[PDB]
């Protein structure tokens, strides 16, 4: 049940200076990048073109190339239209793509954020604001919705091109997506706070508990999922204890890579 995401980040420092950098995810794996420096979109996997032909990709990439230059000027022009209401520095962020469900099913999204706040989305056949958005965006919205050519394209990208393309990727990148890598664990400390480190595991779901015998220590504080450079994950569980009460304590780890045989580290 995977989600496809095109994250775009755009900084406008003043009226002349700006930059736009994109990255593309399918689940937790990066599939594309597009720096301001690059004139063309870069693959970060062998299977990133998907099941598209070379000529289909070219016409798609050229659409983006032209969008990126057009996007920049339009924002700059919308700042002139609203000024002195708004001025630089301005930080616009897009998040677009589709989520894939079994059978035929998929939903598409395109969400836009102004200065870190979700304010606008494409929905149906038009741009519209969301609840919470300031009312001055109404004019920018009115102007963007006048562009009947842009609407027809965005509709085609959300409704057809994206969900089609993602099916291509899912088939084309089966072995990378369904990969199984094993965690490695180790113990440490800093009342005392024992720490059970786990690292190198994929996919993301994992179970980590402190134990005495068969008895789950419900004081265990689970940390966050932190990424490793090699596209694996990291996670630590901590437990507070009395000094000289570390005897009998073990860290148990379950993960789909291990297949029954769980990692147990004793103190």
């Amino acid at each position, epitope marked *: 049940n995977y989600t496809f995401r095109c994250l775009q980040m755009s900084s406008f420092a003043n009226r002349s200076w700006s930059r736009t950098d994109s990255v593309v995810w399918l689940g937790d794996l990066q599939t594309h990048r597009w720096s301001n420096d690059s004139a063309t979109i870069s693959f970060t996997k062998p299977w990133s073109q998907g099941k598209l032909s070379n000529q289909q990709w070219e016409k798609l990439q050229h659409m983006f190339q032209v969008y990126r230059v057009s996007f920049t000027r339009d924002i700059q022009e919308l700042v002139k239209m609203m000024s002195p209401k708004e001025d630089y520095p301005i930080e616009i962020q897009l998040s677009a793509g589709c989520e894939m469900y079994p059978g035929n099913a998929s939903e598409s999204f395109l969400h836009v954020a102004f200065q870190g706040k979700y304010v606008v989305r494409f929905w149906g056949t038009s741009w519209q604001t969301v609840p919470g958005a300031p009312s001055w965006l109404d004019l920018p919205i009115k*102007v963007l919705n006048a562009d009947q050519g842009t609407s027809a394209t965005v509709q085609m990208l959300l409704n057809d091109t994206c969900p089609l393309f993602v099916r291509g990727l899912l088939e084309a990148g089966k072995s990378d997506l369904e990969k199984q890598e094993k965690p490695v664990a180790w113990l440490s400390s800093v009342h005392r706070q024992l720490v059970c480190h786990v690292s190198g595991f994929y996919p993301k779901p994992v179970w980590v508990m402190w134990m005495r015998g068969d008895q789950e220590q419900q004081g265990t504080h689970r940390g966050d999922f932190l990424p490793n450079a090699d596209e694996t994950w990291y996670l630590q569980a901590t437990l507070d204890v009395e000094a000289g009460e570390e005897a009998g304590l073990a860290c148990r780890v379950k993960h789909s890579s291990l297949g029954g045989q769980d990692i147990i580290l004793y103190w």
Partner: T-cell receptor
Amino acid sequence: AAVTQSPRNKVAVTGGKVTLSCNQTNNHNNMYWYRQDTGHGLRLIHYSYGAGSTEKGDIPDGYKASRPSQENFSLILELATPSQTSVYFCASGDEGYTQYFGPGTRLLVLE
Amino acid sequence: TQVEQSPQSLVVRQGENCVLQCNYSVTPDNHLRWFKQDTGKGLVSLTVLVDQKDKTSNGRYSATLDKDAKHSTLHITATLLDDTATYICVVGDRGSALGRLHFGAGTQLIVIP
């Protein structure tokens, strides 16, 4: 959707202040000033997205612009020069792509 | 100079047809407009083409646009004396007010009565 310019024709001396004005009863937010020279197409001098806004266009040097209200967008030549001898077109528009053009204004700047 | 017109000028006898050219490098290309400027007067619109492969008519004026080639022609069937004018090509790079218009220099038609 009509637009008017004034004066329609003007003779001026080098160094004089010359002011070209453009009136529009369309409630169009946006207004534009161009100049046509035999040889080139229309080139944008200044424009305005509403009362109080004025923007530099493509060839803005020598022209100041003034949008005091929704109806009037003015082009001011503070120090007129022979190089500003041209035909000046004004236009207006709403949120869409069309710009509704004025009838043109001829200016001759003499020595 | 992202909009070129051809010929620069032409003379034709009243009754003859003529085809005017307009090629452009403008990106993107939302729409293309043909204007008509009488000597002294201002800009009368003839047509606006908006599609990838578009065609229009306006009585004796008919026109085409190919956005892949980035090329447009304006045909005048059965020229009359009033057609003595300059014919301007204009490409708009957006389908909204955010865009700029890029003007051609113009093709000068002169019609012999």
